[model samples]
Target: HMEEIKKQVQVNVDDIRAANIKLDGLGRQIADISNSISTIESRLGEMDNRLVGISSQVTQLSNSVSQNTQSISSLGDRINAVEPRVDSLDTVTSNLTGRTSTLEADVGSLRTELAALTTRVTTEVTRLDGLINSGQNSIGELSTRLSNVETSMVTTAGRGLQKNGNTLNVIVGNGMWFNSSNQLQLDLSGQSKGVGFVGTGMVVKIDTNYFAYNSNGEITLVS
Candidate 1:
């Protein structure tokens, strides 16, 4: 019986030793699997960061789209606000046409009055011209230099009047209000000149009647 018991114990010990060897192999496999899991976890962390960055970009794109929508809404509001003004021009034209026509008629009357006044002004200027030149010849002469003249000019401080062959001029400078460049120049150079308006010589009837010179220095009848 003792011998049989000792053989049984020895077989049990050998079985336990085999179990421990298998456990050691299992532990090594578990450690290898843990190392692989650690590598996978690190790669997953990089993927998580990349996914977060992509989500941020998407959020920014969404925000930009929302802003664009707001801008469009504002533009629509402004266009709607301006729509009322376009109708007012049509409204004024259709509703107030008669007021515009009355104003145009009044303007036409003013234009007619202006034409009549212009004719009267030209007539008065002609009458004044004849009145000044009829009897007396003044500052402008044939052989003299005349710098300036107004019907008001003869009395001015800057008016230059020289003598003409010992006789004063019959008609001197004729000045026009708007005529500046060629107002009136009767130049009698080299000490001798005659009665002329802007170098157009004149006719002088010494005895009785008044003789006027045309623009070409030709003698014309003036009575």
Candidate 2:
């Protein structure tokens, strides 16, 4: 029985351990996601700086174009090509942002699952505690009561002794008495009844049985 309770405790602990493992895995996954987002943002920052440099170079070329020609015909093609580069960067940034939103959603779902599992483990722990406490109380009480029990021994002329204030007497003059010595063997309800070493050492009574003993000796089993 004690081993079984320990087994129960181990089962609960195992669930908690499994939950921690799941959370730890999620932690690593989230860390990887966060690092990816940081790298993408860093690249975006570098791209923004490059776009500014391109704008400055365009400005220099436009100033030169105003002197070296009639109109801005050559500048028009360069500016038109710049629009596609800007559009491509915008597309990549939008894709990264969409993935970050999904990572946030993944984190939300993981937390909900963890919370439910934690609640289940805690409830199992509380329930096991109540059962363990009750078992300990009963086992303690039984251990306390085990030290001694009532004992009675009939004499040569068939008279018995009383072990306690509540000892039973059969009518006294001469007969057999029932005495139980071991507390473990004694029934909890046995106190209300009478049992003693009888005439033939028989186990039954009718209102009486086939034999009776007084001071003669022990019983001889007859039927």
Candidate 3:
């Protein structure tokens, strides 16, 4: 029974080991995702800087055109007429920057959430590892206790009757006894046979055949 229990425990341990392996793989995948996210954030930062630089350059160019237009009246009229288009360009540039910023915030939030999830996974793995160790220890202790009990039972056999408190126990090597209620009981269950032997110099009869015991307690048939 302990052997079967150990086998089942080992199977469960193997399954847990497999799950740990898969969890480790998942941790690695999460790390890779984090690295990828970091790279993407870095790239986005560079793009945002470039957009700022481009917006500043556009502003400076508009200022230069305004100064040139002021020095020339007909050019001033043409430049003044084109101011709406320049403003439209500024609006579009600002909108793009806003959208990029929003995306960056979202990515940052996703990274935070992923990191929290990783922490939870790590904690769960630690917990499972502890449980596995504890389970193995318990099984080992149980096996030891069972061995001790079996040895004690065998050693106490054939010691005649023993008593503890109000209970009486009959210890015999032959493995048969009468219960407290006077019912015959065999210590070994499940298809056991020929459990006891006739002592030496004892005569026995079975099925109309006479059986005799020799000096060594071996059985012999007598007519």
Candidate 4:
């Protein structure tokens, strides 16, 4: 009976040792699993940091592109505005060129007419001087005769004159002249007064036959 009890005690001791060994193995496995979980968490944190950096870069690039686009649009608008103004300036220059050409032509014609007029006036003056010297005319009488000749010339040239009755009143459209009664009269005054011939370089004459008087102090042309 004593030997049997000893054998049972040894078996119980072996079982307890085996159970302790199993517990140690399970603890090692649990520690290994915890280390693996920590490593995975660290890797996930690194990935998150990389993603944030990439996102920031993308956002900055988008903003830069947007700014560049806006600047380009503004430049296009300025170019469009300048185009029309440049065209308008070109048109104005063309118009000015045409007007300058026309003015030059008109000036040339006027110069030609002035030269002819000067030559004719010189010839007439020479003839008049010769006539005065040959006729032995007095200065006062010559002056009177020249004035009458000028008056006749103006009358024959269709330059209207003003007169009242027998007395010359006013040269029509040139100036007013009074009669003996101190009344305003015109050489061609009438109900149908025509346009008078008082113009630059024109000499007016008095035509007493066509004279009339008006209540207003105006010497006008007759029909």
Candidate 5:
């Protein structure tokens, strides 16, 4: 009975030593799990900070894009308002171009009329010169005939040369003479006294001091 009791006490001491070893191993595993959880938490905090910074930058970018879009829309509205004015200006320009073309046509017609007038005036001037030349030639011939008549009168004295009306008579040392009436009778003949005669027919002229037949067939310079 004494040997049995010693054996039982040894068995109880072995069981207690096994239980203490199991408890120490469990405590070591719990400490390792706690260290792993702390490391995971630190990494998660860093990732959260990076995500917040990115989100703020994205928000600023979105706001800038929105402002740019608003500005573009306002510019488009202004362009829309100005489009009709530009169209009206185009219409005014087109009307002006048409009016300018009509004015140019009218000016062309006026230029043509002016050219025709200039040509007509030039022709009339040439015709006037010809008429003047013919008149001068006729007057020169009448003056030559009068000079011959004067020479004949000076040479022949009292030759019974009856003078008629419209006949020119020139006397030496006296003057040239002409009748004013158209009658053929010598008594009705009116005389003009002048030292010199110029031109002929209706264009005749005499000096102011000379005596000529008056409108009544009277030879008088004093009148």
Candidate 6:
């Protein structure tokens, strides 16, 4: 009976050693998972950085649009200004006729330039629209991916792989982060909203307009 008891103890010890080996392998796998999560987070940050550059390009395009509009309007004014001179051409001498021809040539060149500018502006508008659409779609996809990642992290927590003091946080650029509760927190105080004034309080963008609170506690459009 004593020999049987000693055999049983040895068997239990062997089982414990096997369990330790498996647990060590599991720990290594968990470390690998944590590294993968970190990689995903950095990649997401790069995406955000690229989006910021896209926004800057959009702003530059908007400025170009405004300048083009002004140029077209100025061209119209020039045409109107020259109309009376053209009307008086037949009443004038040969010298005036020669001057009028020169004026016409200048106007023709201006018109050619105007047409080229119009085509350029049109192409830029189309390109800008494509970029905006692409950016929005990318953001939508990122949101979905973040939600999925959060869900996966929650599942991982359920499996006892919680890190960072029982919490996992995904930090993002521009004062944004995802907490352990899967809540997105944004703290953009004193940060430029990429349009109008710097945001002092809660600011939201809606269809090319920025809305924010004033000192009087009223929501108003930002510039």
In model 5, where is the ten-residue run with the lowest total lDDT?
Answer: 182-191
Summarize candidate 1's per-residue lDDT along 1-223 as a digit string, tens digits. 9999999999999999999999999999999999999999999999999999999999999999999999999999999988888788888887689888888999999999999999999999999988788634643462243433333344323234454654443345533222247355434342234322433553333322666667886677676
lDDT, residue 80, candidate 1: 94
Model 4 agreement with the true structure over 1-223: per-residue lDDT tens digits? 9999999999999999999999999999999999999999999999999999999999999999999999999999999999999999999999999999999999999999999999999999999999988777677788999999888753322245454554553344544556588776554442235534464222234464775444574555566
Candidates sorted on TM-score, descending: 5, 4, 1, 6, 2, 3
* Candidate 3 Cα misplacement greater than 4 A, ranges: 1-87, 154-223
In angstroms, give how far residue 221 of model 6 lies from its true place: 99
**Per-residue lDDT of 1-223 in model 2, one digit per residue for the tens?**
9999999999999999999999999999999999999999999999999999999999999988877674566688789999999999999999999999999999999999999999999999999999999999999888766643323443333344333444543433333233474222322233334453344343433233555544565443445
Model 3, span 88-148: residue lDDT tens: 9999999999999999999999999999999999999999999999999999999999999
Q: Name the lDDT of candidate 6.
A: 0.80
Worst 10 residues of 2 by lDDT: 182-191
Candidate 4 residue pairs in clash (backbone atoms < 3 Å): 161-187, 162-186, 162-187, 163-187, 188-222
What lDDT, from 0 to 1, does candidate 2 have?
A: 0.72
Alpha carbon lDDT of residue 86, candidate 1?
78
User: Which parts of model 6 have CA positions greater than 4 angstroms off?
Assistant: 84-223
Give lDDT tens digits, candidate 5, residues 1-223. Answer: 9999999899889988998899889999999999999999999999899999999999999999999999999999999999999999999999999999999999999999999999999999999999999999999999999999888764433443534565544333222333466332222123353222233322233555776668985656865
lDDT score of model 1?
0.72
List the candidates' TM-scores in order. 0.36, 0.34, 0.32, 0.42, 0.50, 0.36
Q: Put down candidate 6 lDDT per residue, 26-79, tens digits, no spaces.
A: 999999999999999999999999999999999999999999999999999999
Q: Where is the poorest 10-residue window by lDDT in model 4? A: 195-204
> Which residue pairs overlap in candidate 6's backbone?
none
Write down the TM-score for model 2: 0.34
